[PDB]
Symmetry: D2
């Protein structure tokens, strides 16, 4: 039984693909594999009041199908909160509510997802030219192999730590913050260092300040103070489908310009509200004569080591061009991610994937990897397309249209 | 040819009824009569920057059917502006765009509306019990009569002038501001008085200031300065279906409390943005040493007379309990409206309509007038229900659910 | 030793008077008596993050003397926070910082205040016409009498409870909220009722929600939801000195209009930020399926009794026209105040104070009580002038100019 | 007659120096020379509604002397607008009001400024070591030479045009926009190109759109849409005196970091309000089906030639790496400035001034150029210190402390 399409991973990207498949009149068979036990979207960073980067209209389907049964608006209506949400006049749901939306949409889906199923390899299919691919899957029970004419790789971002720092009991990546924080004894988090200059860093510093009034927090950033995220309407435009075209068709010079002029837009920077709240918190602490927030500007974390009951963080000060140690209970590295890369999953198939001038994968406008005539199946990428498609590649700004374009491409070439 | 329902008027209210009829699986036959040549929604006040009082989610259908083909979102999508609108992060469309939305929705409607058709009378049908009503319609050509099992009266608000003032060549009601303004020698309006303290008053003053740099404007209001409109979430709530229930089921004391505590919500007051813009305009003019905006506080217009080339406005000052004259070119009365009166059209049909203690029509929760048992036809009111259903009666805050409830009532009794 | 002027009370009003005295070149001798042990400005409501109702420019002196050494700006500069404050771009200090400002200003004052000095009576001095008053002062030590040519009464508002409700161990007025709350067991207060519809009510509900995650709060208000405070620029104008003139010189009709149109300005209503925060809190609780905030609309507290381990609050529902009981741990009445009563401290002297035809004290523009020629002393009121001077009477919106007026009047008559 | 200090130029920088001199108890003699007939601060960009980049507290003196008679607050008070300004709750004056403030402050100044006095050279005084300098001053009338122990050069920024583009009748630099615009028939500019991506560019495009309804405008910018200015509190901090210290004492790496992370602060970027207004304008035009604003993204103006009745603007598109000609009435280059350069006026004295590695002038913390022992005169720079003192060098964010520092340095050395 050869599936038209297998989806590797079930985050919001492949969820939008599943929705696009259902909504499409095309008769496509599919299966989706997710390593985790259920849908799990950045749960380590589901802080109270944390807000979505994108508006509720940039959901799973609305920009493609404005009357989708999977829209955020349909969700709110079924939950009996559409009116209440509307009265709030806020375009941005909390990340918590958005997670509930994902789970609701997954349930509404006709076709069931296979969980506890980690894809370990993608292998060529019998036949030459290769007409299909073989997907190896591991369940807690056994292993199994499935076959597909096309595959959609959407395995998400990979956590990035500072060079020379490794995660441990006392050194956490921001992606795991709440997982560790949960049932940690408070007495044991009297002092926390948070490295990074972006949204997750600021959110965590603010959560710590608000959660425990005794915790001392060192915010270690390369900039001289948090830099604001650009959320103005012309900025929001670079994440429109039309801007994907402009970036895709654009010269290397133009592509460089996108990243140069517009890199201050989401995760590497911080929302105006979060910044103001932090500054307010610092100010009121000063009035009260009880300072707690230490903003360590123009600095980087270059090492961490557990010494007795202390996590000794080595900090490099750019101003002074010297490094020095800071003892804390826990170091949190809100230091971002590396992009998705299909390379390693693809193993031998990789060799048939055409590369570009800088050694990166070529990809067509419809998110299809460029291949040699030795390979005839579709390997589509949701994520990993920063070089070809631009800044929207790992975000939730364009789920409806990217998933629709991929389904349309599959129907087309079938 | 006896219709299931006839709608009198085709403003947004009956437009939402038509949509509710189409979306309902019930086989109801209908006809709508509009006296104007085409849909025409407060066109005299379609000023350049003017904004809707309600959010785009409070459209024709979405609160009832979140996947309606008639939603504002579906409209934006067909117009190719959904993404552009979403990036703006504004819940409130301009009144101009909303008018386009109404026209778009009217076109998308399967059933055609009868325009240039003024309903002149409604009268009791043939027989006992009275199972239908006869609706007399004047068209440019000839009059005719139509029969219906149910009627929905939605003829809108009636312009109200200050006691002692009549509309003329130089005395306008705000509802006809742009109609008159477009037709004038532009250098003919160097001095304008605008009476009223509410949204239309402030919008017109602001438009005049912005429109030419030399116009002198007298804003005459009973308050000491414009009072702000309450647009907070707890206030938007009174305009929700659930709050219609609370008002409807509520004692006379409770109903009085709604109007007392929450009268400062929309048209009698002024949105924060407009107020700040006007104040800013006044301030900058003062810096420039060129004052143009005269705010006449705690005052009322009590008469108007044309003397030669001047409209002589008689203004009563509350502060000093005396009146004085002010010479201008035009006086605009942004002095609001009287509610819809279903008594207008009913004539002999009232006989069968039950009044209350104080002589106001009794109306059921489903917007159906309470009738003597000889009358079996449904007379439904969209508007005119201020006493029974509350502040939402003449607004666009609840179109989807009111229209749905009326359609459901009609089907139920069928 | 006969003083030119004696100040009764030392809140912000008499503090601004002390400053006006020091800045004036006139050689006036003064003494101020404060019952408390030190300056104490609404300390029971000094909640975290609570904000001033007035901007930092409406301080003790700036509107009179823009280069005062007692300005809020001079305070910030001496504290080394002027730049930090300026970068925040917020016109409204926290009430906690404002309290620090009052203490700083009091210290900078050359002339020392007599604390622990309760004024118990004001009596006619010797001789005719009466050229001085006698001020009876109780200290913990003894009692004494001081003599003065003029007196300024600024004793502040008086806590008002709902009719039929007395303050007790478990029934608090909002003015003492933090005083009681600090001396209480965190898990003693799992259920709290807060009566009132104004700023203090909403702030307290917010504080409770934020301070413990398990507390259940019943917000009992006469309106259908919190009503927003008007803080637009035309609204702030009614608190300008120029608007005091308009109100003072205005007919009764006019004065009525001020209170009618502009009652929605400060303490009886709730600032937009606090309202949105509460609504957001309620919404997120609903998402989490853990409701804690119970908004009891259209209702009044009409009685309270202690029964075993509970406080039984009798609530009247306007909608249902019935009353019912609500068991809580503590009832907080954020039910406002009655105005300062100049007559309180006045005995025989009242007989020489002229009333109007509704029985209210006549007061000149310069805040001087109108007296028969039998009395030549100045009795000035800071507070208690709601009928004569208007809405600004008990606020901090006009401290600089009211105090300056009073000092100028005193010098003029000397 | 040898002055203690001579100021070259009389913009806001030397204006703050004059104030600092007057407020200082030190007996310093001074003279200021301005080439224009009167104070003239960016008058070509005094557009309607244009706002200051810095708050009113960042005025001539307040951060140094919070009770200065030259503060923006004292100005407002003398103008009878302090209360009116305060009620507006806006930290940012219009540029027009700020200009009035400068004029007011200049008038209040005891010592009169020499206008129509262009400084043409600064030369060594007699003797060695060099204890004075001679300032050559050209007037319309004559020339003369004055002698000074110290000089402060504050001659402002120098307009910069795109490479290969010269200003002409139809090619304007933004600094002269209103000067040209006002000398044109109102109907003479129906088509306009505006090059640049920063504040002045956006302000001009907005002004044009708002000023006539027919004007077509091409906004040509290197970015993909306007980029927002960071005006958050941590950002405003780099402009405080404490941050000048951090930048001054900082390594080259740290200084580079300031410019790298925080270049997006003022003139190179666009404020939130302006951006949203433009996007709104574009959206409403689209709804109206009358597009006028053409945003040309990822593009540079590379040439301009007059051809008959047109200006043929040559635009380079980075996207497609092709050029095309855009015919219009006028090209406005809002392309910024080059910094102040003291070498200009210095000539022979330069040999006594010490340069660094990259050939830049060395400058002490107190803004004094570093000199050899042969030169004992103070040459102070207000402007031209971007390399040594950082981003605040050419702004008005630090007038009070920079001027005070310079005066203190002069007194110290005396
Ligand atoms: C707090 C936060 C921080 C963020 N940081 C950034 C950032 O710094 N930069 C940026 O560009 N975007 C960032 N993101 C955005 C992020 O990429 C998205 O919001 C979104 O998660 C992406 O959707 P996705 O479907 O591509 O996948 P995901 O949410 O990443 O999930 C992919 C799924 O694939 C599964 N999976 C992976 N490998 C396998 C396998 N071999 N077999 C089976 N299943 C597998 C995973 O379990 C996962 O559930 C952040 C988001 C949040 C909430
Ligand atoms: C500028 C402005 C000011 C407003 N002022 C207020 C206010 O002060 N207070 C308030 O509560 N609401 C006010 N409204 C809100 C207003 O009622 C609603 O926006 C709105 O028109 C929708 O409801 P409708 O269909 O009930 O009304 P109506 O729109 O106005 O439309 C009804 C239609 O019935 C037609 N009609 C009337 N009689 C007959 C007949 N005999 N035969 C055939 N056709 C007929 C009319 O021509 C009209 O087309 C205002 C709205 C705007 C835009
Ligand atoms: C939380 C809060 C709620 C408020 N509620 C309202 C409101 O509902 N309505 C409103 O209009 N304004 C209200 N206010 C504003 C309030 O009045 C002012 O902020 C301020 O307190 C007024 O200054 P004052 O000096 O006039 O009075 P106060 O600040 O009250 O100071 C009066 C002083 O006189 C002292 N005193 C009294 N009697 C004697 C005596 N016999 N002898 C010696 N000393 C005496 C008192 O101890 C006190 O220190 C509120 C303010 C806050 C912060
Ligand atoms: C629209 C606008 C755009 C701006 N653009 C930028 C920008 O792009 N980047 C940036 O960093 N800041 C920018 N600024 C900030 C700006 O420099 C300040 O606001 C302020 O002008 C600087 O003060 P100043 O006194 O140093 O300079 P100036 O305001 O420029 O004043 C210098 C004065 O010296 C006079 N002068 C010059 N030479 C002589 C001479 N030889 N003899 C006698 N007098 C002389 C001039 O006539 C002038 O009056 C801008 C400001 C505005 C309003
Ligand atoms: Br968005
Ligand atoms: Br709902
Ligand atoms: Br929003
Ligand atoms: Br993260
Ligand atoms: Br501190
Ligand atoms: Br440190
Ligand atoms: Br995202
Ligand atoms: Br796409
Ligand atoms: Br699509
Ligand atoms: Br709304
Ligand atoms: Br679209
Ligand atoms: Br909005
Ligand atoms: Br007339
Ligand atoms: Br009219
Ligand atoms: Br109107
Ligand atoms: Br509802
Ligand atoms: Br109720
Ligand atoms: Br004026
Ligand atoms: Br008045
Ligand atoms: Br409406
Ligand atoms: Br309803
Ligand atoms: Br319904
Ligand atoms: Br003094
Ligand atoms: Br506390
Ligand atoms: Br204020
Ligand atoms: Br400071
Ligand atoms: Br503010
Ligand atoms: Br009790
Ligand atoms: Br109490
Ligand atoms: Br209180
Ligand atoms: Br005033
Ligand atoms: Br719930
Ligand atoms: Br107050
Ligand atoms: Br006053
Ligand atoms: Br005064
Ligand atoms: Br600033
Ligand atoms: Br003033
Ligand atoms: Br501001
Ligand atoms: Br020597
Ligand atoms: Br030029
Ligand atoms: Br410029
Ligand atoms: Br492009
Ligand atoms: Br120079
Ligand atoms: Br500046
Ligand atoms: Br400095
Ligand atoms: Br200084």
């Amino acid at each position: 039984p050869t599936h038209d399409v297998v989806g590797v991973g079930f985050g919001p990207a492949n969820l939008s693909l599943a929705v696009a498949l259902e909504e499409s009149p095309a008769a496509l068979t599919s299966a989706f594999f997710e390593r985790r036990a259920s849908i799990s979207w950045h749960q380590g960073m589901l802080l109270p009041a944390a807000k979505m980067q994108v508006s509720f209209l940039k959901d799973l389907a609305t920009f493609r199908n404005p009357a989708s049964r999977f829209s955020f608006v349909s969700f709110l209506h079924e939950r009996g909160r559409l009116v209440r949400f509307a009265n709030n006049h806020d375009f941005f749901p909390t990340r918590r509510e958005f997670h509930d939306y994902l789970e609701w949409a997954e349930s509404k889906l006709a076709h069931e997802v296979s969980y506890d199923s980690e894809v370990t390899a993608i292998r060529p299919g019998p036949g030459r030219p290769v007409d299909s691919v073989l997907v190896d899957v591991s369940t807690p029970e056994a292993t199994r192999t499935v076959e597909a004419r096309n595959i959609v790789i959407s395995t998400g971002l990979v956590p990035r730590m500072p060079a020379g720092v490794q995660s441990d009991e006392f050194v956490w990546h921001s992606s795991r913050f709440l997982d560790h924080f949960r049932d940690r004894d408070p007495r044991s988090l009297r002092r926390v260092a948070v490295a990074g200059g972006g949204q997750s860093a600021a959110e965590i510093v603010r959560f710590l300040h608000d959660n425990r009034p005794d915790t001392v927090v060192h915010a270690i950033m390369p900039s001289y103070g948090y830099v604001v995220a650009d959320n103005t309407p012309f900025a929001n435009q670079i994440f429109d489908p039309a801007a994907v075209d402009d970036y895709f068709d654009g010269s290397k010079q133009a592509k460089d310009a996108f990243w140069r002029y517009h890199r201050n837009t989401n995760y590497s920077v911080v929302d105006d509200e979060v910044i103001r709240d932090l500054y307010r918190r610092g100010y009121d602490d000063e009035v009260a004569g009880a300072p707690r927030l230490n903003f360590v500007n123009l600095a980087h974390v270059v090492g961490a080591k557990r010494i007795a009951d202390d996590t000794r963080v080595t900090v490099y000060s750019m101003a002074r061009e010297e490094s020095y140690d800071l003892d804390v209970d826990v170091l949190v590295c809100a230091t971002g991610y590396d992009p998705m890369d299909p390379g390693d999953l693809l193993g031998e198939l990789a060799e048939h994937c055409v590369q570009d001038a800088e050694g990166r994968w070529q990809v067509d406008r419809d998110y299809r990897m460029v291949t040699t005539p030795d390979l005839r199946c579709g390997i589509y990428l949701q994520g990993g397309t920063e070089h070809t498609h631009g800044l929207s590649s790992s975000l939730l700004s364009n789920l409806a249209t990217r998933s629709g374009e991929i389904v349309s491409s599959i129907e087309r070439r079938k």
